A paper describes a structure:
Homologous double-stranded RNA (dsRNA) dependent ATPases RIG-I, MDA5, and LGP2 (RIG-I-like helicases [RLHs]) are key cytosolic pattern recognition receptors in the vertebrate innate immune response against RNA viruses. RIG-I and MDA5 possess tandem N-terminal caspase activation and recruitment domains (CARDs), a central DECH-box helicase domain (Fairman-Williams et al., 2010), and a C-terminal domain (CTD). LGP2 differs in lacking CARDs and thus independent signaling activity. To gain further insight into the role of LGP2 in the anti-viral response and its co-operative role in MDA5 signaling, we performed structural, biochemical, and cell-based studies on chicken (ch) LGP2 and MDA5.
For co-crystallization, we used 5′p palindromic duplex RNAs, the ATP analog AMPPNP, and a construct denoted chMDA5ΔCARD-Q, comprising the helicase and CTD (residues 298–994) with the mutation E436Q and lacking seven residues at the C terminus. The structure of a 1:1 complex of chMDA5ΔCARD-Q with ADP:Mg2+ and 10 bp dsRNA (chMDA5-10) and a 2:1 complex with 24 bp dsRNA (chMDA5-24) were solved by molecular replacement at 2.60 and 2.75 Å, respectively, as well as a 2:1 complex with 27 bp dsRNA at 7.2 Å resolution. In all chMDA5-dsRNA structures, the helicase is in the semi-closed conformation, but unlike the semi-closed forms of RIG-I and LGP2, Hel2 is well ordered. In the two higher resolution structures, the electron density in the nucleotide binding site clearly corresponds to ADP:Mg2+, presumably because of slow AMPPNP hydrolysis. The ADP:Mg2+ is bound in canonical fashion by motifs Q and I, with the adenosine stacked between Arg330 (motif I) and Arg302 (motif Q). This arrangement is more similar to that in chLGP2 than RIG-I, with helix α3 being kinked toward the nucleotide binding cleft in the same way, allowing Glu369, stabilized by Arg330, to hydrogen-bond to the 3′ OH of ADP (corresponding to Glu67 and Arg32 in chLGP2; compare Figures 1D and 4D). In the chMDA5 10-mer structure, there are two 1:1 complexes in the asymmetric unit, which are arranged exactly as in the 24-mer structure except that the dsRNA is not continuous, lacking one base pair between the molecules. The bend in the dsRNA axis in the 1:1 and 2:1 chMDA5 structures allows two MDA5 molecules to pack closely together in head-to-head fashion, with a center-of-mass to center-of-mass distance of 43.1 Å and total buried protein-protein surface of 1,961 and 1,907 Å2, respectively. The head-to-head interface involves two-fold symmetric interactions between the pincer domain of one molecule and two protruding loops of the other molecule. The beginning of the pincer domain (812-SGSAVER-817) interacts with the loop preceding Hel1 helix α9 (489-RSNS-492), which protrudes from the surface of the neighboring molecule.
Numbering used by the authors: 297 to 419, 422 to 466, 470 to 636, 642 to 869, 872 to 918, 928 to 968, 972 to 988
The structure:
RNA sequence: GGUACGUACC
RNA sequence: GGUACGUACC
């Protein structure tokens, strides 16, 4: 069942029920989406009784939230009274969006489905005037160049144009923002915190920002905060894995004569060594670029030794050199690759390989954070009958490696822990992705009980419905104040704890403290804009709105300048600098995957196993990855990744990470 | 592929 | 603005 609100929910709803644009700030577990449904039904029922056209769009930022808001909230209470539909880019609908607007009263979709129609591109459109109410889920993203903010910039442009036609009357939707924390925008001062709150208010055209105050006690009974802990590890353990890896890196640096201005295993080392790899490739210095590539792989092993067990560090290097054997070795079905440097670096590893493998088997040198994590898990999974937990970590590799650490250790299995990792769907990582369906099944098994502990990246912090946790561990991960409150929001079972496990040397404890500081500033700043007199608030809101419109015009003029011709360019291999393609030889498939056409192109490469296929293309002369094969219309075609080539010009040699960075448009 | 946001380091 | 890690949308 029956559509009602709690008193704290009604308190924040009241102005939206009277037709005012507002932002609603309700904590995690407060039922913000239930408030959205009550306001949707109320809004539509009033439009019926006034014989008027009622229409609502609910905008979300993740695809699963479309289906989730339908099932749990929107269909149960509205389906029998109004036409309701959930829509996404993933679902190939046979109806166009403009028709979906004509047929349905409540549209729940991802924001880019609306923007695609407002833009058109391919050209009677949809406009924001078609909708009488627009609800934005997770409205703290209504910021900068986000899709939310682009939708709302059209709304403000239509608001200003409306006053021009009064003096010489196009209808404007009501707007409702829903969030748990609008944020502080990286501010370190209360002034800049209050500036950020007003900017978000300005972007959503809010009459007022809305929080629970009269029924604050009721809200505190509904959602109980977890107990906070900070488990620090000083790491005064001797670290012979770090020491011997550094000796290998030092040896390599003397060979190539590349010397850093920065500590081993640190972030500026990683920047330097990647810069040095790029430079050496441009300048045809195979010795330097190959060494810098390996040095990076050793620099990875140091920083994963810092966060996870040193066996995973071993495996990172061990797998790299396994793949190096495969590419450099002349196999059958092929129509020397091994340089001096290649031979030097391979033997260096094999020599010092024995020690590292067997040093890695001794857990006494195996990372103090892991014991602190172990101890925290043991004491918490023995605390309750049917517990559930999440470990938040920085890298995908770290998520998978922690899963193996939990599995390759029978005392966690003994005490009832049944772990599984959880990572992103994107394909920009050097680790492989989980698909959206695999993500869904893991989260479903977590609610079932089949799975007990998630080792998650930031995938698990916002939006998605996850079962109430007894423990949330931030394992070395400290991002922003919004993510912090969202992570703390997952721990909402009876007797739940939120814990930061980190090295004192990482500076993550100090960054957690500024995010606590920022969170406190946020509440003071919300309080200040609520107490601000209307005339003062209105003027500041108008300023931010006007200068936000100007902000898009500037970025429009930036992107206009860079707006080629092929055959200007050749393609050299980054490792060995052999001539391979001209610019005329390249053609594109569905304007995304680039392919070579040259008639005698097969002679310049070999095929190896390890998106279309799982067959790599590698350089004949040197074994450098160029990309992979693909099947298109029954033709075996070579897909070349731009990362792998030095691109020469006629007038200059440069390396690009994306095909779009080249100032050249290619054929179909 | 394209784009966006978050964080760290320059 | 750059590099990397992470996430997402089309
Ligand atoms: N006024 C209400 N009456 C009954 N149940 C409610 C009410 N508000 C919320 N709920 C229930 O609580 C749940 C909301 O939890 P959740 O989705 O975690 O909230 P939020 O999205 O704010 O974090 C829903 O399953 C809903 O059925
Ligand atoms: Mg909800
Ligand atoms: Zn080559």
């Amino acid at each position: 069942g029956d559509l009602t609100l709690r008193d704290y929910q009604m308190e924040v709803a009241k102005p939206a029920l009277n037709g005012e644009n507002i932002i609603i700030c309700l904590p995690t577990g407060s039922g913000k989406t239930r408030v959205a449904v009550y306001i949707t039904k109320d809004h539509l029922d009033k439009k019926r009784k006034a014989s008027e056209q009622g229409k609502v769009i609910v905008l979300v930022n993740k695809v699963p939230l479309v289906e989730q808001h339908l099932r749990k909230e929107f269909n149960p209470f509205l389906k029998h009274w109004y036409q309701v539909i959930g829509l996404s880019g993933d679902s190939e609908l046979k109806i166009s969006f403009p028709e979906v607007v004509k047929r349905y009263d409540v549209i729940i979709c991802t924001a880019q489905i609306l923007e695609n129609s407002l833009l058109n591109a391919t050209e009677e459109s949809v406009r924001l005037s078609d909708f009488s109410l627009i609800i934005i889920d997770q409205c703290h993203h209504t910021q900068k160049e986000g899709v939310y903010n682009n939708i709302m910039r059209r709304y403000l442009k239509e608001k200003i144009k409306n006053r021009k036609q009064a003096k010489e009357l196009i209808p404007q939707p009501q707007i409702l923002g829903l969030t748990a924390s609008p944020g502080v925008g990286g501010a370190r001062s209360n002034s800049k915190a209050e500036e950020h709150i007003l900017k978000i208010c300005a972007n959503l055209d809010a009459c007022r920002i809305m929080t629970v105050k009269e029924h604050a006690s009721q809200l505190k009974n509904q959602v109980k905060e977890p107990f906070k802990k900070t488990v620090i590890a000083d790491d005064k353990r001797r670290d012979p894995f770090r020491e011997r890896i550094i000796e290998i890196m030092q040896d390599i640096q003397k060979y190539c004569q590349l010397y850093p201005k920065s500590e081993f295993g640190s972030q500026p080392y990683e920047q330097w060594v990647i810069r040095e790899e790029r430079r050496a490739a441009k300048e045809e210095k195979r010795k330097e670029r190959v060494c810098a590539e390996h040095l990076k792989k050793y620099n990875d092993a140091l920083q994963i030794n810092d966060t996870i067990r040193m066996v995973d560090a071993y495996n990172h290097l061990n797998n790299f050199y396994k793949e190096l054997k495969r590419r450099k070795t002349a196999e059958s079905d092929d129509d020397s690759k091994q340089d001096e440097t290649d031979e030097f670096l391979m033997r260096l590893f094999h020599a010092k390989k024995k020690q590292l493998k067997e040093l890695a088997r001794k857990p006494e040198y195996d990372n103090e954070k892991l014991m602190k994590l172990r101890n925290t898990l043991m004491e918490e999974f023995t605390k309750t009958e049917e517990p559930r937990g999440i470990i938040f970590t920085k890298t995908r590799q770290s998520a998978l490696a922690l899963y193996h650490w939990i599995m390759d250790n029978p005392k966690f299995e003994e005490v009832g822990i049944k772990a599984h990792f959880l990572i992103g769907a994107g394909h920009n990582s050097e680790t492989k992705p989980m698909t959206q369906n695999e993500q869904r099944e893991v989260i479903d098994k977590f609610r079932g009980g089949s799975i007990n502990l998630l080792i998650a990246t930031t995938v698990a912090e916002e939006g998605l419905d996850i079962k109430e946790c007894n423990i949330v561990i931030r394992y070395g991960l400290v991002t922003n104040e919004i993510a912090m409150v969202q992570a703390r929001g997952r721990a909402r079972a009876d007797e739940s704890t939120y814990a930061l496990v980190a090295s004192s040397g990482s500076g993550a404890v100090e960054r957690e403290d500024v995010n606590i500081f920022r969170e406190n500033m946020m509440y003071k700043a919300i309080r200040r804009v609520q107490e601000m007199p209307p005339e003062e608030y209105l003027n500041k809101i108008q300023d931010f709105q006007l200068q936000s419109i100007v902000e898009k015009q500037m970025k429009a003029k930036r992107d206009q300048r860079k707006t080629k011709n092929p055959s200007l360019i050749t393609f050299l291999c980054k490792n060995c600098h052999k001539l391979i393609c001209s610019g005329e030889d390249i053609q594109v498939i569905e304007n995304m995957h680039h392919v070579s056409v040259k008639k005698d192109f097969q002679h310049l490469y070999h095929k190896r196993e390890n998106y279309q296929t799982n067959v790599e293309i590698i350089c004949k002369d040197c074994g450098q990855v160029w990309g992979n094969m693909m099947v298109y219309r029954g033709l075996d075609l070579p897909c070349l990744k731009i990362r792998n080539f030095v691109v020469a010009f006629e007038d200059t040699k440069e390396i690009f990470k994306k095909w779009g960075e080249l100032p050249i448009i290619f054929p179909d």
